[model samples]
Target chain A: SKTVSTINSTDALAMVEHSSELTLSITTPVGTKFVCRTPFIGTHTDKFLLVEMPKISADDLQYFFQEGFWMNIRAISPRGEGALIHFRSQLMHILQEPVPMAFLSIPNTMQVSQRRKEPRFELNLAGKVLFDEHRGDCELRDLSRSGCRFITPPLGKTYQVGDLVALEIFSDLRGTKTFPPLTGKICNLQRSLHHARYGLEFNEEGRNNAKNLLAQLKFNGTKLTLN
Target chain B: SKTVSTINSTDALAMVEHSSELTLSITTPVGTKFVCRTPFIGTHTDKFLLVEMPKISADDLQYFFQEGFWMNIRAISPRGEGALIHFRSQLMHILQEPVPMAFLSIPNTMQVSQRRKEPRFELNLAGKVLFDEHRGDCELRDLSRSGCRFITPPLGKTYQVGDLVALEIFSDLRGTKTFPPLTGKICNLQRSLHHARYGLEFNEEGRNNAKNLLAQLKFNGTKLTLN
Candidate 1:
């Protein structure tokens, strides 16, 4: 493993929390490869630096640990520094279930009609590059077992049929059930008001993560479907 | 076996063109029973007195038929003048599903907030009476793997704990996808301006039906906790 680099706090939370063992390996510029095994934690983010070969210190990490960040981390042997780091993260929180994919079914129409009720989940829609300047504030419409539809406002941009988009879906089901930000490709597009409709197809990684979340949540009425 | 009654149609069009095997049965004033079976084309309350029982002249049957009065015919053996009658009513339509439940968790203070967007399902609010006196419309909030919430207008009639209220959720997804009609009971309630919060627990039948519906139509990213 090229030692995972640019690991976002969002994606890392899902992997570490769900899996019991993770192997991290990084190859330094000087032709040396190092590996580490660490236990998982539910929420954690930190930084690591690869200096010339060996010595490491607290200052070597980049970002402060909270949640969802993207950075590089080097792996150490199970008997080495990796064990110490894993223990620290584990103490912070236990793993939670990953979010499900069935909930992420963005509709092709992108027409969101609000019921004037409090939102069950709020995703970060701003800061996103406008694919269709015509589509407006895409509110979520009905959700099905496999997909969801959104009602976009009138001024959102138009996205190419195959454009890849990155946005955050901040769920209300957090803490109760775990979900990380999702990345997907715009698989379908349709004409809407000023905004263009875009349908997302989660990549393989996204789908797996969603499956884990739903399984843990047991959302199919065997357990409650709340957040 | 006791043979039911039979009714004859003198109207050539009804006798030949409308080839339907219709049956009707009603208890008579006496302890005896009346059953009528005929290939007739008429309303539910059509008359078949003389025609279904002992064969009468066309004039007698025609007069009763025109009056649209319900007729009673006695059960007779196969050797009787008319065919035996056996009638049954169709079953009523009911919908059930596995829905979200209210599990006791860390209770958070309920806050009042305006809905940022429309809910995923249409909502119908009504009083839990045989004849609803005060009823309003509501919209569905986002659903969770846990339970769903809805936004309703201010309610004048205060509901007690464990009251079973009727909700008519309008979704093309119902009946078609295992979510017949949701019949939920009030589990938690909160009041606000122009809006009231209601937490419902699906009845046993409704919960099971909702579960089937979820399996058929649920998605992952649509749920969130209300903080």
Candidate 2:
């Protein structure tokens, strides 16, 4: 049982609202982890955090709330300090008019982890995942030094929980540049009826490549840097 | 059972072998049909027809042969005469060197159909499929007056056999030009464990739009015209 931390503090609320670009990570009931970068729309009257929905399959969105998942939000402050916030949230409501928004419940308590290593960023890119003789088109959701998350067409039964796979990002969703392939092990998976989310724990070599690629993307003003 | 027609005649065999830009269409056990353009790679010593594999998911290829489905090929000569050839074929062998080749069983007899109304062409273009409140990325594989086939991320259970959907091709998969949307019904579906193949029977309005779009694509040298 995790107790809620000091989430009601002005500093914390300001950090959540001001950090317009933040990474939202969630693990589905099937154990697949998905990460996406979305902006904070506004807070509901009930204090629910309103966030824009990520571009994911409808099934993923359905199961994502059904399972009562925990969301990990990594936000960076104006001073370049990274803040990790965790809360158990579910889809409480959806707004349709001004902009598409999902109202998520705020936990009575929240957990905060402050020690940051390499910062993470939210990226929406198209890529491929290859393992053994099987390959599938995947969307690279987010990237970090330790690992990454992606959404793929249902993997069928080819991949298991601990399988190793190779990932290559062809380019950003809007650009034409390609990233080198990296090797990682599937640490978690969330399967909906039609698609599956995957969390990969990058190996040593993958970590180096991920770091280099993020630097290049940021340097070129690709604007995917977390900080 | 459908009997084989005069598909083994020299003229028919020559048409199959000489028409390099032919499209191969096959239906899976689940009733989902897929179409891909492949050249008539040389025939095997045993007279098996050789064709390069189309770019598709591994799961599709697996179920494609698991049921030993019949293959329907449409080849139009460069001079604009439609040729329809039907044969019951399965993967007989696969060659790795020189180029990837799949040796397929030749039908003992073949059927040739004439009296073409509207011709079809293979189109590999990126697009989106919209239904209800859901949307998924799709690739338009083939198009004709009657129907079209597209590959989508496993639609999971979001769509059904008779669901009405809207399809829009953003571009020819290579350019920035967009095509108008078409309305259609999901007549058939083939689902791999990971991906789903959708066969859409266009409505009357959709048929007209498809024809206009194909003509525009051809005019721009997109080369998706069957004739």
Candidate 3:
């Protein structure tokens, strides 16, 4: 007889489509529960799922998330048009973590330093956007356990689906740890304004580095909900 | 009788000190050699007579007296034995407006906090120290318009300075920010096992809020640096 496990892949997929309320029950071994909520199905890609929540309360943002608190989420949204639907995510809350993206509000009049064989990047600091080639310029946007999104200048050059690229960032806040440029393979691309958004997936080494980087950046504070 | 303009009590003190640093020169103003090694007596109290050096480089420290960067000597070591004693001081650097103070390492455990008092105070973030009051729980040790020194805890703090009466700090570091609770205060305070050393000064009114808070806190970061 073969050992059987509950909630197969088909069932999970079915739950994703049919469930109006996705409840991710996070439980400690002794039975402690910490629950957070968000709108269901923020975005779905072939590889991962995205959830949505409003900007946390400013105080909480500074206190909780800034302090690096772990959270568990239970999302609720419409399944179809009417009847209630419910599905429980497989202990995802326990495994999921929060990643930060440094937002850049780049200024319009920035000097683009170079055209690289690869994509270039830019950052907004003190009301000015400092653009750099495939080299020193780039702003950290948001990060996930596996990858990061950086804000950069539009690269008119074509980035093939599997092209490798490097990214770098600097902040007085983080001091001098150079993020050994990540070897990311171009996964997706979209155009906005004059810049092109290229999505990249980390190689095996990049993934490990990402985890270490996130741990390095974590703080300890309570983030409250935004009104 | 020729009515002479006399120095008032305060101005007299300043003039006397100024006179010690000045003498009838061989020729014109530019050619006259000004040899003044601060901290001049009562200079700290006079404020106006204090040595002011522009954003000084290490080269600046070497030529402080020769360049006549005399400002108010906010503090001075107790007059000690003999002529060649190294003097310690805190002076406002004219160029960057940062106060240069001797770097002194204290115990790793210190309780420091900075209040975000709005409508008053300001400081320079580029050369300011930010300690984690709750996370890394590091203590600031020294400062200049260019950089600072801090003491890292061997083990994280379980109780804050307000709670712990004193602690023993041994090892420390200079020029690094790779740890948690990224920024903190830089200041001077009496050492105690139960109490931590901290330094602070009132920043300018309506200056940069974050920088001012960092300056005011001295050893405390925006949050607790307990790690």
Candidate 4:
């Protein structure tokens, strides 16, 4: 049985008007993932679905307002099958009640993938990083199949873009075993007052290892993990 | 000493024509502060200043490119006095060179305040938060005259937008003494997999207390601080 079906050609109005318990997933540019339940409020023009704002973090909300996010919605039908609707949207306006309500825009051409994109997980793990003979303790802030964000103090050594780095997740909150070292290229970096946060894109081999590790962690139900 | 001088009537062209050792200060929307020294490279019409992109964290560069930030530039004159030019600017284009540079916009009617609009310092203090009889430990992430951002786990009690909260910075990394309790109203909330982060605006009394605390902290030159 097909678990997901595209709603692009289906009657969008009828699906939203009749469906209940829609699951929305959005990944912010910073790589934070938000998956929440929202209701279909109404429709805008025939190309957009007016959905109530899902419960989100303030930072996520700010990102949504400033730079609209891409979201995938799975509307479960009473029959048990679900229609997956995917679109890039933003906050259109807000209705101020005792509890203010936000109306988000759903664009036309609602594309859907039967297999949704893999969810990224937040892994605040302490790790050791080495790049060009510079070594330091770094905190892996978040992780995904593609890339991960980690924070490190100002290393005595400098790193340039495209520099390959080796990272080992030494310990997490749960006191897990040290994961094998993964090597990826430094794609981005941010400097705070004292820490330098680096964004690294995993190579093919590294990505595969990350995926397997994430699968095992998820399967084990690690208490400190967040998706 | 009048360290900052307004350049409302100064020719924008002459400032970049032969200025050296220009200092740029910008606070990202997310409250990250970046202060860098850059030399003026060129200009685009009078509305843009093209300068060498100073060495910054990769994250800082992404933030600068994704959501251009407001920056204040102080051009130290050949005479040794400084002309403070403030404007909302962003990266317009980048030039790859033996010395890589960035083209930044310089708007008309540059505004400047001698004190430079009170600087918002980052205070990652540890605190206890109380709301509706539910209490939890929170991390005071960033602070300004207007509001603060804090992280807390999902409380047993639900919090609304107008809900008032009491918070106390019991101890920080430096083992500081307990600060007087502060009262603020919840302005926003965001949820991650493990925690609920909040954006709070201090009440009149709370704002006053926060200002005082910030002043004392700044004056004391607290280490482990980020601005």
lDDT per residue as tens, model 2, B1-227? 22234645334554443315557777876888777776554342234565665666788677664434567766543222345665556656554432354557766666665443444567777777888967777878888887888888663444556789988788554545567877898866654335567778899988888877777765235437322
What are the per-residue Cα lDDT tens digits for candidate 4 across A168-221?
Answer: 776345545567666898775543233466778799888987776666564224
Off by over 4 Å in 1: A1-227, B1-135, B142-147, B155-158, B173-179, B216-220, B224-227
Indicate which candidate wins on lDDT: 2
Give TM per candidate.
0.21, 0.28, 0.22, 0.29
Candidate achieving higher lDDT, 3 or 4: 4
lDDT of 3: 0.32
Model 3: docking quality category: incorrect
Displacement of residue A53 (Cα, Å) in model 1 is 25
TM-score chain B for all models. 0.33, 0.47, 0.18, 0.46
Give the range where candidate 4 chain B is weakest over 10 consecutive residues by summed lDDT.
B10-19
Tens digits of per-residue lDDT for model 1, A98-181: 110000111111111222121122222222333333222344332222322343544555444456554333245342222553
DockQ of 1: 0.01
Clashes of 2: 7
> Candidate 3 on A166-219: residue-level lDDT in tens?
654342344354544555666544332334444566788767765655554533
Give candidate 3 misplaced runs (Cα > 4 Å): A1-133, A155-158, A174-177, A220-227, B1-227
DockQ for each numbered candidate:
0.01, 0.01, 0.01, 0.02
Q: Please list the C-alpha lDDT of all candidates, in the order they appear.
A: 0.33, 0.62, 0.32, 0.58
Docking class of 2: incorrect
Name the candidate, 1 or 4, with the larger lDDT value: 4
Query: How high is the TM-score of chain B in model 2?
Result: 0.47
| Candidates in descending lDDT order | 2, 4, 1, 3
